[PDB]
Design a protein around this ligand. Structure first.
Ligand SMILES: CC/C(=C(\c1ccccc1)c1ccc(/C=C/C(=O)O)cc1)c1ccccc1
Ligand SMILES: CC/C(=C(\c1ccccc1)c1ccc(/C=C/C(=O)O)cc1)c1ccccc1
Lengths: 232, 209
């Protein structure tokens, strides 16, 4: 059978998101690769390209996402894809202070690293470490980025907002079970959502660089989302 | 000092700090609109610096941090004001009572314009209240660019929740609304960044010092 998004309990929501999680990918094994700007950027581009395929699979499993039209799915992914890659990056890097774990075989320190955003990404990773962000909260945040980033760059909008309310209910439940008071729940929720505005900022600066050097477009993402129908 | 204030006095303080609605200087053009917008922005910025000094907790920061926050937040603060003023004018942006521009006038930017209109429509649909708006504007200033800032942000969160509880929202409705409001700040950020991209201390430092 199929659960509709708005019917899910907090436990069913977490289970759906944990199950949908993509794998941690490795960087290309290429030891003799040269050190240049275009070289490192190439490693990152190749990694991002492969993550994007898993990202589509993940997006299709975020409750409510397939309730939208293909056109609306593409708009949301086009808005969110870099923010999603970045929150993934910051999550992976939490146990490596001062470094970004692009992949288990591509752990970069500050001197190796992108001029403005590296320190921003490190700052974000530190803040999640401080707050002791849990995996269950992380998957909720990532789903929020997907549903929210493109909603006001666009009944059907109402549905997205009701799904977002469901994810918020799920976050609150996790925080209540963790032993936070009503007031602490509200403060921690607020802190997390303000960090999302920083991730948006980082994505914007990231995109500016990418457009000045093509980059994932409406048309690529439309093809990839549609191509999902043909997978195993 | 902010940490000692009640939720009601926070609200009162923020409402008292609010800056005035300014006027723009017959039909328009490109540079006519842009010069009018720049002149208005310049004048709004002076009032914004005076507003920030009255946001409880802001003047306790170092002058270096005050400058950094205002440099980071100024376009977001001008946009959230604009969107707030435009709430009751579907499909138009109320830059000033004498400067109300529809979508097609936006072409005289129309990327940014449509994004602003979408924000205004969202606030309308949510029935954003004045007491909530001033809390959001303060969050924008404090979050733009350090435990003291975090302490005040937690206080503003408490104050938002206090306002919702007083309006009779259930405990569930309280967290849902808080999230709805704070999610809009990601979009205000995005809009500010697109504006800054199109557009590309003395004033700040004089007024703040
Ligand atoms: C934040 C790091 C990063 C990535 C990246 C993030 C997470 C995982 C893998 C890579 C990035 C780099 C290039 C691209 C894609 C370029 C392209 O497709 O032309 C996408 C993302 C990036 C993004 C923009 C500018 C500089 C670096
Ligand atoms: C979104 C409206 C806007 C404003 C503006 C916002 C609120 C109130 C009045 C004007 C804006 C326009 C020009 C400036 C120029 C500043 C400068 O030249 O130093 C600043 C803000 C703008 C901002 C960036 C690009 C195009 C238009």
């Amino acid at each position: 059978g199929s659960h509709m998004a708005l019917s899910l309990t907090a436990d069913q929501m977490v289970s759906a998101l944990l199950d949908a999680e993509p794998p941690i990918l490795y960087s290309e094994y290429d030891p003799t690769r040269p050190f240049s700007e275009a070289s490192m950027m190439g490693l990152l581009t190749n990694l991002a390209d492969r993550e994007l395929v898993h990202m589509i699979n993940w997006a299709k499993r975020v409750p409510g996402f397939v309730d939208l039209t293909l056109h609306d799915q593409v708009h949301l992914l086009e808005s969110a894809w870099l923010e999603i890659l970045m929150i993934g990056l910051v999550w992976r890097s939490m146990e490596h202070p001062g470094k970004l774990l692009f992949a288990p075989n591509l752990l970069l320190d500050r001197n190796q690293g992108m001029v403005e955003i590296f320190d921003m990404l490190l700052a974000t990773s530190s803040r999640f470490r401080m707050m002791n962000l849990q995996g269950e909260e992380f998957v909720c945040l990532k789903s929020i980025i997907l549903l929210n980033s493109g909603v006001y760059t666009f009944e059907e909008k109402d549905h997205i907002h009701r799904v977002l309310d469901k994810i918020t209910d799920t976050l609150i439940h996790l925080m209540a079970k963790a032993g936070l008071t009503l007031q602490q729940q509200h403060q921690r929720l607020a802190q997390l959502l303000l960090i999302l505005s920083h991730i948006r900022h980082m994505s914007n600066k990231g995109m500016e660089h990418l457009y000045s050097m093509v980059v994932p477009s409406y048309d690529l993402l439309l093809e990839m989302l549609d191509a999902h129908r043909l997978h195993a």
